[PDB]
Amino acid sequence: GSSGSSGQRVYECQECGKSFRQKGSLTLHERIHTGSGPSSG
Numbered sequence: 001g002s003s004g005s006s007g008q009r010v011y012e013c014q015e016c017g018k019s020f021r022q023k024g025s026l027t028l029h030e031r032i033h034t035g036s037g038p039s040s041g
């Protein structure tokens with residue numbers, strides 16, 4: 001925290017909730033996630 005960069009960010013799925021060490025890992029996970037938009041309207 002003193003000697004270095006503070007904070008951290010990870011590619012966590014904001015749909016089901018899944019952390020991915022790699023960036024592509026999440027991108028490929030989006031495949032199963034096919035539903036961008038409302039349903040009851």
Ligand SMILES: [Zn+2]
Binds near residue numbers: 016018029
């Ligand atoms: Zn997901």
